Structure 1
Amino acid sequence: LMKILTERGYSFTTTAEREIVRDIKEKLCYVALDFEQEMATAASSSSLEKSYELPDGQVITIGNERFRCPEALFQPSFLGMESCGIHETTFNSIMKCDVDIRKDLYANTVLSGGTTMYPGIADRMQKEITALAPSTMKIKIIAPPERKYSVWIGGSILASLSTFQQMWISKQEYDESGPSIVHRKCF
C-alpha cells in the first residue's frame, strides 16, 4: 500500500499515515472473488468505493486499490514478490505428503493468521481451492471468522484441561531429560 501510493504520486512515507492505512485495512477493506471479473467491472466504469471520512481529519479512500492490494499473492509478479504463488505452494504441499493420507489431509483446510484483513479473501481462497482440487480428492474448508485471535483461543482451550497435564512438562522431568525435550514432548 505504501509502495503503490508513493509510486502513484501521493505523499506517503510517514508512520502516522501507516497506522491510518492499517486501520482502514482492518475495517473498510473488501476483496475480489476473481482476478478477472473485478478488473472487468472496474474497467467498464469504476465504482467499488466505500466512502470513509475519518474523524481524525484525513480523507483517504479509493475503492479500486484495496481489492488489488492482497490480490498480489495470487500472482506475485504483480508486486515482484520473490515468494512462490499460493496455488502452487498448496499443490506442492499436498505433493510432498504421503499419497494414501493425501485425500484425508486435504479434506481439512483452515483459515489462520494475519491475513484476516477482511474475510472477503476467504471466499476467493475457497474458490481457488475448488479450482485446484480434482474429483479424486475431497475438499472441506472450515471457514470461521475466528481467524484473528485463533492462536490465543487455542492455548486458552488447551491449558484449561486437566487431562492435558500429561503432555505438560514438569520441573522434575525437565531436570531428568534436559532442556531441549520440550521440543519433543510437545504434540
Structure 2
Amino acid sequence: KAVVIDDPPLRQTPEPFDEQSAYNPQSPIAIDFGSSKLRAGFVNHATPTHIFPNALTKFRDRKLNKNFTFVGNDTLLDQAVRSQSRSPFDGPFVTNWNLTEEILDYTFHHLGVVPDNGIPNPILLTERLATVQSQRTNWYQILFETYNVPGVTFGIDSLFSFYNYNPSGNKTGLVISCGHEDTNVIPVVDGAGILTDAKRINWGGHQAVDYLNDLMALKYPYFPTKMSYLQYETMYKDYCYVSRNYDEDIEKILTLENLDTNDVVVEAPFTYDWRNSILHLFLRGPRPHDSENIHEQHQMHLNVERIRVPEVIFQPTMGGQDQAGICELSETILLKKFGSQPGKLSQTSIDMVNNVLITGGNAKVPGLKERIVKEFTGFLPTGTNITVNMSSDPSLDAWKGMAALARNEEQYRKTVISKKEYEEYGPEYIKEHKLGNTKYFE
C-alpha cells in the first residue's frame, strides 16, 4: 500500500503556566536558546518544564483591531498561525532582538515568576562556539540592563552535555554535536574544552531538510501539489537512516530484490520492458506505472535519498561545502594533534577515544553510532578500546548539564558574571572557564 502524510496535528490544549506559590527568588533559571526548540525550567527538577518551538506570531483580530501574540505551543492552534510563525534565528545567529525579548517575557510569565525591578534569579544560558561578540554584547544589553539579572553564565551546549554525562569535571573525551544549524567536534582534555582544536561543519537538520526539498522538487518537476516544510521534516524523521557502508549500498539499491523491501511510497494530501529500465525503477519503483491514475500522480517514491540525505555530514562536498567530514576531523584530532604521532597513540588520545560522546538533536538518525564505531576502528591502531555513548534523548542533555552545573556549587561560581564585573570591565570581557568560550587573542 501507499501511506499518506499530512501536516502534524495541532495542539488541542495550550501550554499551562507554573504555580506562583512555589516560586523562590534564589533558584536560578536555566534557558537553552536553541534554534529549533527552546527548553527552560527551574534547576531543582531534573527534566525541563517548558519545551516549545522558538517562534512568534503577531496575530491581528479584525473585530478587536489588536495585535495578539502567540508564542511557542500557542502557535500550534491554527494552521494559519502555524504557517505564519517566524523564528528569531536567521542561520546560526540572532538578527532581530524584539522577538527574543518578547519570547523571554513569555517564558518569564509562564514559569510562575513574580519579579520586581527586573528578574531576581541568576540566568544560565548557551552561546555558540566562537561567536561574534556583537551577539554577546546585545545579550548583555538585554540581560544586565532590561532584566536586572544578578548573574549570567555563558557556555556551549555540547560541553554542557559532556558535563552532564561526566559530573566530575575532570574527565577526558571527545564530543560530537549534531545541532540544527551546525556540526561541531570539540575535544575535551582534563575536563576543559580545547577550543583551539575544535572544528565546525556548516550542516545540520535544517540543511538536510532543505536538501530533501531540493531533491524532491528536482525528481518530479511536474508535481501539482505544493507541500510545506513540516512534511519534508516528517519524512526526513521517518524514513531516513545512515547506511553502514555507502560504497557498497549504492551498487545494489537499484536491484529489483532491494526495492521489494527497501522502498517506501508516500502520498500527497488532496481532496522494452520496465524491468531493465534504471530510470523507471528510480522514479516509480518496482511496480508498473499507471500515468492516467489521479492517485498515482500524487505519489512520492523514496529509494535512494533515504541513505543519501543523512550521509552529507560524512561527505560535506555533496552538500556544496568544501569541508571534511566527521571521520576526517576525528582522525586528524586523534592521530595528528595532542602529542600523538600517527601510528603511536598518546595517553590523551586513548583517553579521548575511550569517552566519545554523541549529542545534539540530529543524533536520532539510526545507524549513526555503528557507522562512527566502524570508521573509528578503521583509522585507529588494532586493539584500541573504543567506547561510543549516546543518550536516549540527546536533544535534552544540555539542560541537564545546566542543572548538573548549577547543583554543583563549587565550580558554579567560577562561571558567574555579576553586574559589578560587567560595569567595571565593560561589555568586552570573557570569563575563561572550562565550559565556556575563550579569548580571541593570546
TM-score by length of 2: 0.36
**Alpha-carbon distance in structure 2 between the residues aligned to 1:63 and 1:29:** 10
Cα deviations by residue, 1:33-84 (Å, 9 ceiling, x for unpaired): 1113322441322421345568798864514312111113333343443111
Unaligned runs of 5+ in 2: 1-211, 272-297, 341-345, 436-442
Q: Counterpart amino acid of 2:356? A: T
Q: Which stretch has the larger CA shift, 102-111 or 68-77?
A: 68-77
- In structure 1, what is the equivalent of residue 311 of structure 2? 71
Cα distance change of structure 1 residues 108 and 55 upon mapping to structure 2, 3 Å threshold: farther
Match of 1:154 among 385, 401, 419: 401
User: Residues 359 and 394 of structure 2 are in contact (CA less than 8 Å); yes or no, is this contact kept in structure 1?
Assistant: yes
Q: Counterpart amino acid of 2:313? A: L
Match of 2:431 among 156, 173, 183: 183
- In structure 1, what is the equivalent of residue 231 of structure 2? 20
Secondary structure class of the residue paired with 1:110: strand
Q: Counterpart amino acid of 1:146? A: D
Cα distance change of structure 1 residues 164 and 51 upon mapping to structure 2, 3 Å threshold: farther
Cα distance change of structure 1 residues 24 and 152 upon mapping to structure 2, 3 Å threshold: farther
Secondary structure class of the residue paired with 2:242: coil
**Alpha-carbon distance in structure 1 between the residues aligned to 2:226 and 2:431:** 38
Cα deviations by residue, 1:15-50 (Å, 9 ceiling, x for unpaired): 952221112222332221111332244132242134
Cα deviations by residue, 1:93-138 (Å, 9 ceiling, x for unpaired): 2222233322222222111224324132222122111212212643
Computed over aligned residues only, the root mean square deviation of the Cα atoms, in angstroms, reads: 3.3
Q: Which runs of structure 2 are paired with 1:80-99 in the superposition (5 Å)? A: 80-94=320-334, 95-99=336-340
User: Residues 133 and 139 of structure 1 are in contact (CA less than 8 Å); yes or no, is this contact kept in structure 2?
Assistant: no
- In structure 2, what is the equivalent of residue 115 of structure 1? 362
Q: Counterpart amino acid of 1:97? A: F
Cα distance change of structure 1 residues 52 and 31 upon mapping to structure 2, 3 Å threshold: farther
Secondary structure class of the residue paired with 1:44: coil
Q: Which stretch has the larger CA shift, 47-56 or 143-152?
A: 47-56
Unaligned runs of 5+ in 1: none
Secondary structure class of the residue paired with 1:142: strand
Residue 145 (structure 1) aligned with residue 392 (structure 2): yes
User: Residues 240 and 307 of structure 2 are in contact (CA less than 8 Å); yes or no, is this contact kept in structure 1?
Assistant: yes
Match of 2:373 among 111, 119, 126: 126
**Alpha-carbon distance in structure 2 between the residues aligned to 1:60 and 1:31:** 21
Higher helix share: 1
Match of 2:255 among 28, 37, 44: 44
Cα distance change of structure 1 residues 11 and 124 upon mapping to structure 2, 3 Å threshold: farther
Cα distance change of structure 1 residues 60 and 135 upon mapping to structure 2, 3 Å threshold: same
TM-score by length of 1: 0.76
**Alpha-carbon distance in structure 2 between the residues aligned to 1:11 and 1:163:** 63
Cα distance change of structure 1 residues 7 and 175 upon mapping to structure 2, 3 Å threshold: closer
Cα deviations by residue, 1:136-183 (Å, 9 ceiling, x for unpaired): 643221133332222222212222333343434263773697366653
